[PDB]
């Protein structure tokens, strides 16, 4: 891929990031009346009125503004916005009796769901660690560490390893099945690898290094498919595969059958998840100062599977999910999987040096810019038909904020520059 093409792709991202995506959030999100962030915007960019400030929404905003700022974007206001978020997290969402952050507040900042959900706590560590790295405000590291310590105490399974993932306010484990107390999941464990990476970057402490590596090992040895290297979504405590169910606590709009199961509840993998894992693993290794070769086999399997099955060569973009063995189940185009495939395919090129990953990359890039970005507003359509007709028309809500897309724009520029240097 020529230097001119590299530079064209990079300029397209940068101009869109600076004049479309960040302004969409900068001009809308700060709630000065109640604190924290407004994130419910309809297809016209107007508040759609939902009475929710979710942990995911608030922490993802903190992460986005901290990380965009630390990467050099937004012109200064992003750090101030992140600090605004962190105030909300601590003053409204931190449990001062039992510790940990609450799952849901309403718009006034009152607690409506007081459960302790490791998936959200993962995003608390991630975003508050990134916030301290970006601003030097020690509150971020302080609460990331508090939350890390509570996860070790209450969530780590000292026999089988890994983490139980959903608890009541008082940290007692929730019941079985949909209540979320008896499964260990790819989604939590991968995002913990992501959070621990930044926590370690922030603190430099051995325990955080040692447990980041323990988490990588868990993912690679237990969560990934033993043959195909692809992420298996759900396990019992003993790491035997569990039927993939919807939980009572959601943080996305994942499709299930009416009984709350996936159609192939035991043979279902997500190309976006697998690409996301692979590049976040490479980023952890960078932070650890280890070569990508440390997990060459795993990284190769993740990227190879994704480009072989998940890339829609004919119409552009990445499918939703499919079989570990190769069959596609759902050819719709959901926003966050495009974002994660952008980063992953550049890193697959950087590391594996196969032009097919650059071919895959521009495919996904062209789909994102020509079909998925709602250019009049600056945000991404959340769900489209295979061929790129919008199905869902919200710009954002309690679970779709700006964590995936801002990160993929910044981190795609980052890897395009590294590619450009290698001639």
**Could you say whether residue 379 binds ligand SOR (CB under 6 A)?**
no
Distances (CA, A) of 313 to 270, 316, 343: 17, 6, 18
Q: How far is the CB of 242 from a second copy (least distance, A)?
A: 19
Of positions 136, 252, 291, 326, contacts ligand SOR by CB under 6 A: 252
Our measurement of the distance from residue 305's CA atom to the centroid of its chain's CA atoms, rounded to an integer in Å, reads 20
- Ramachandran angles phi, psi of 272, nearest 5°: -60, -45
- Residues in the interface with ligand SOR (CB under 6 A) total 9
Cβ neighbours around 91 below 10 Å, total: 12
**Could you say whether residue 159 binds a second copy (CB under 8 A)?**
yes
User: d(Cα 334, Cα 317) in Å, to the nearest integer?
Assistant: 9
- Of 212 and 343, the one with the shorter C-beta distance to a second copy is 212
- Of 276 and 312, the one with the shorter C-beta distance to ligand SOR is 276
Of positions 83, 184, 273, 333, contacts ligand SOR by CB under 6 A: 273
User: d(Cα 386, Cα 200) in Å, to the nearest integer?
Assistant: 39
**Could you say whether residue 206 binds a second copy (CB under 8 A)?**
yes
- Of 10 and 397, the one with the shorter C-beta distance to ligand SOR is 397
User: d(Cα 33, Cα 105) in Å, to the nearest integer?
Assistant: 15
User: d(Cα 289, Cα 229) in Å, to the nearest integer?
Assistant: 23
> What does 65 interact with, of ligand SOR, a second copy, none (CB < 5 to 8 A by kind)?
none
CB burial string 162-171: b at 16+ within 10 A, e below: bbbbbbebee
Reference 44, options 377, 290, 370; nearest CA is 377
Among the candidate windows 11-19, 148-156, 397-405, 413-421, which touches a second copy by CB under 8 A? 148-156
Number of residues that this document lists for the chain: 423
User: d(Cα 140, Cα 128) in Å, to the nearest integer?
Assistant: 4
70 in a labelled binding site = no
Among the candidate windows 14-22, 120-128, 158-166, 243-251, which touches a second copy by CB under 8 A? 158-166
Q: What Rg value do the Cα atoms of the chain yield, rounded?
A: 20
> What does 157 interact with, of ligand SOR, a second copy, none (CB < 5 to 8 A by kind)?
a second copy
238 in a labelled binding site = no
Torsion of CA 391, 396, 400, 406, to 10 degrees: 110
Of positions 1, 6, 26, 173, contacts a second copy by CB under 8 A: 173
Distances (CA, A) of 76 to 81, 140, 213, 224: 9, 18, 34, 40
209 in a labelled binding site = no
**Could you say whether residue 163 binds a second copy (CB under 8 A)?**
yes
404 in a labelled binding site = yes
Q: How far is the CB of 33 from ligand SOR (least distance, A)?
A: 26
Reference 295, options 239, 188, 218, 232; nearest CA is 218
Of positions 10, 40, 400, 407, contacts ligand SOR by CB under 6 A: 400
User: d(Cα 81, Cα 32) in Å, to the nearest integer?
Assistant: 11
**Could you say whether residue 122 binds a second copy (CB under 8 A)?**
no
**Could you say whether residue 69 binds ligand SOR (CB under 6 A)?**
no
84 in a labelled binding site = no
Q: Is 265 helix (H, G, I), strand (E, B) or coil?
A: coil
Question: Which residues within the stretch 187-246 sit at the binding site for ligand SOR (CB under 6 A)?
Answer: 187
Of positions 336, 349, 380, 381, contacts ligand SOR by CB under 6 A: 336
Annotated binding site for D-sorbitol: 60, 187, 191, 399, 404
Annotated binding site: 60, 187, 191, 399, 404
Query: Which residues would be at the binding site for ligand SOR (CB under 6 A)?
Result: 187, 251-252, 273, 276, 336, 399-400, 404
């Amino acid at each position: 891929m020529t230097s001119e093409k590299i530079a064209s792709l990079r300029q397209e991202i940068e101009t869109y990031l600076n004049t479309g995506l960040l302004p969409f959030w900068i001009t809308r999100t700060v709630d000065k009346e109640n604190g924290g962030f407004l994130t419910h915007f309809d297809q016209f960019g107007n508040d759609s009125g939902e009475d929710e400030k979710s942990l995911i929404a608030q922490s993802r905003s903190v992460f986005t503004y901290s990380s965009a700022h630390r990467a050099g974007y937004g012109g200064g206001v992003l750090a101030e916005m992140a600090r605004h978020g962190v105030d909300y997290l601590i003053n409204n969402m931190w449990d001062n009796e039992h510790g940990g952050f609450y799952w849901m507040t309403n718009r006034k900042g009152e607690v409506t769901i007081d459960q302790k959900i490791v998936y959200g706590l993962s995003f608390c560590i991630y975003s508050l660690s990134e916030y301290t790295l970006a601003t030097g405000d020690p509150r971020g590291r302080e609460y990331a560490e508090k939350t890390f310590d509570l996860l070790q105490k209450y969530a780590v399974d000292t026999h089988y390893g890994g983490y139980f993932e959903m608890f009541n306010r008082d940290w007692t484990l929730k019941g079985p099945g949909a209540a979320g107390g008896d499964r260990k999941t790819l989604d939590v464990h991968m995002h913990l690898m992501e959070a621990y990476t930044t926590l370690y970057e922030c603190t430099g402490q051995e325990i955080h290094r040692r447990k980041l590596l323990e988490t990588i090992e868990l993912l690679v040895n237990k969560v990934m498919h033993p043959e195909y290297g692809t992420g298996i979504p759900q396990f019992w405590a003993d790491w035997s595969v569990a039927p993939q169910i919807k939980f009572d606590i959601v943080w996305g709009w994942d499709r299930f059958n009416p009984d709350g199961l996936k159609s192939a509840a035991e043979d279902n993998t997500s190309y976006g998840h697998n690409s996301e894992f692979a590049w976040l693993l490479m980023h952890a290794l960078d932070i650890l100062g280890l070569p990508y070769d440390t997990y060459r086999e795993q990284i190769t399997k993740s990227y190879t599977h994704a480009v072989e099955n998940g890339v829609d060569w004919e119409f552009g973009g990445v499918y939703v999910e499919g079989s570990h063995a190769g069959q596609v189940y759902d050819k719709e185009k959901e926003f966050w999987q495009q974002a994660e495939m952008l980063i992953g395919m550049l890193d697959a090129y950087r590391f594996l040096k196969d032009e097919k990953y650059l071919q895959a990359y521009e495919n996904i890039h062209r789909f994102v810019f020509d079909k998925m970005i709602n250019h009049s507003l600056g945000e991404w359509w959340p769900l489209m038909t295979r061929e790129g007709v919008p199905i869902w028309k919200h710009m954002s809500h309690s679970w779709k904020i700006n964590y995936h897309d801002v990160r993929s724009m910044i981190q795609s520029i980052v890897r395009l520059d590294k590619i450009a240097k290698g001639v």
